[PDB]
Amino acid sequence: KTIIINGVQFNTDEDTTILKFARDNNIDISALCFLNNCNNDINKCEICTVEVEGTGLVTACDTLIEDGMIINTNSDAVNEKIKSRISQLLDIHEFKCGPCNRRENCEFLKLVIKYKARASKPFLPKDKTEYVDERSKSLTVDRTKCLLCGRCVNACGKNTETYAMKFLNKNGKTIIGAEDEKCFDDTNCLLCGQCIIACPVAALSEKSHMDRVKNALNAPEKHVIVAMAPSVRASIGELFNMGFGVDVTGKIYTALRQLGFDKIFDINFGADMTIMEEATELVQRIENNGPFPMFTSCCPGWVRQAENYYPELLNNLSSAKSPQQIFGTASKTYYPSISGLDPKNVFTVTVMPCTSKKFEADRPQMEKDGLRDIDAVITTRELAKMIKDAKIPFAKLEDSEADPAMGEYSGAGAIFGATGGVMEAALRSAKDFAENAELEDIEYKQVRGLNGIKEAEVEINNNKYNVAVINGASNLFKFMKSGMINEKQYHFIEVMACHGGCVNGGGQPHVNPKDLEKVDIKKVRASVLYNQDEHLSKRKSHENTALVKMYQNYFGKPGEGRAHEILHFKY
Ligand code: SF4
Ligand code: SF4
Ligand code: SF4
Ligand code: SF4
Ligand code: FES
Ligand SMILES: [Mg+2]
Ligand SMILES: [Mg+2]
Ligand SMILES: [Mg+2]
DSSP states (O other), X not given: OEEEETTEEEEOOOOOBHHHHHHTTTOOOOOSXXXXXXXXXXXXXXXXEEEETTTEEEEGGXXXXXXXXXXXXXXXXXXXHHHHHXXXXXXXXXXXXXXXXXXXXXXXXXXXXXXXXXXXXXXXXXXXXXXXXXXXXXXXXXXXXXXXXXXXXXHHXXXXXXXOSEEEEETTEEEEESGGGOOGGGSSOOOOOHHHHHXXXXXXXXXXXXXXXXXXXXXXXXXXXXXEOGGGGGTGGXXXXXXXXXXXXXXXXXXXXXXXXXXXXXHHHHHHHHHHHHHHHHHHHHHTTOSOOEEOOOOHHHHHHHHHHOGGGGGGBOOBOOHHHHHHHHHTTHHHHTTOOOGGGEEEEEEEXXXXXXXXXXXXXXEETTEESOSEEEEHHHHHHHHHHXXXXXXXXXXXXXXXXXXXXXXXXXXXXXXXXXXXXXXXXXXXXXXXXXXXXXXXXXXXXXXXXXXXXXEETTEEEEXXXXXXXXXXXXXHHTTGGGSSOOSEEEEESSTTSGGGOTTSOOOOHHHHHXXXXXXXXXXXXXXXXXXXXXXXXXXXXXXXXXXXXXXXXXXXXXXXXXXXXXX
16 A cells, blocks of 8 residues: 655555554544544544545544545644534533643643634533532543543443443433433442543543541541552552652652551552452362352452342352452451550541442441441542642652551562452462462462453362453453353452453543553553562562461451451352
């Protein structure tokens, strides 16, 4: 093929779109509704318009290059069209960036600036009740910002295959929303937030827990614990212009102190707890030659997928609480026992890459004696915003350490944030428990990385066992619907709702589609976790010295008795 673009000749055998070809050859073409290799097929944004001689204006993002094409990306006709489309969007957009939670990284604002576009008639709604939906424990919709670009609908379809996010017709007006305009929680929605990550604007957001947290921090009698997820320390630096793949563990700890939190713990300690419990459960099932498979139960997106689509699997879930809830339960029981705090005054906050964690933390039965396991959950984004509002100079902060009693973690806990992390961590402990040894080969590289469905055969004490790692909620559906689950007896299966694992959660920093072209965000975020695992002296959960003291002195034997009554949960 011979293609001419902006007067430049290319000879190529590529079968691809004008947009992709252009960007591979450093020619600028704007795009808005194109993401995840699809665009909005029914009301195309046309922001990727280019001129093809002999044809006229075409959308670059979904038009294949053809021998003979002469393309202009920057003619007057092209810029007037794009500008016009942006102006029409401004007519349905409450353009007030000051207070807007996307002010610093909005794709639309950038386009508005780029083409110097203006509304024909400013949109200034007087009743946002109509436009805002805050019923969900995890997601919020603000339709005054919604461009009807369809990226959330497409992202939900590709990432989950639930299509819980849909276009809806509301008396002649098109909106997005859940089935029948219900609260998302009341539908098959997983509450994973992949739709938020796909949104170019402030139209979708996490349900804020920031007021919960600030009220608690300012309440004199509340002792506010905070603990962050594995993924936050690999991610939050992005939002302070530190670049990608930066380990900021120590800066976070210092930042949390400066925000006024009273105790700095770490959910990776909770991850080591989950393993203590679940690896023990796996050995029990192995000893009792059943029941199989056991599924992980740490990802609440997957738990909702099971509840909504495979309720017959709920009995197969490990009864170990997730790192978050297990940690939270311990923070109301063990931690008062070693600190003297009145348990009612402990307020336990997590920092999560995840929107679905807010739903999990607010589950009615996730409490004991009237005390919630977890009182508040803020996303990575929310924490970033709290830090910025407090004017903490995050990139400049010095490293500090977590408080050790519920803050130490092993390398096994550290890699939880990546797909295959839980599997690898659990196998490190299950192999030791079952064989009563302290094995040296602990790296299970076969369960790592971005393949959608990953499997491995593992030897545990003279028998072969089959494990699987399902990476993405859409891959759960594939694994089940294709009957892959029936090709062999599976013994232990990890499921994560977000492809890449939690490092790609719905609570994570947005990344500009351009940067996504440069960086594999899933791999670069995960790399921080695996690097920690490599450089930690303890790389097995049951080697965590703080955790071991906690079990010796308070919980007893994992997976039975007290530990089973307190730290487990069945759906
Ligand atoms: S979504 Fe973007 S353009 Fe719209 S008000 Fe917020 S920052 Fe401004
Ligand atoms: S909520 Fe966001 S991604 Fe979904 S259609 Fe509106 S602007 Fe696009
Ligand atoms: S939270 Fe997940 S399942 Fe629900 S609409 Fe968004 S992408 Fe779909
Ligand atoms: S994979 Fe992690 S971030 Fe995604 S829904 Fe599950 S727990 Fe949340
Ligand atoms: S980016 Fe091509 S039609 Fe929207
Ligand atoms: Mg298309
Ligand atoms: Mg306080
Ligand atoms: Mg059990």
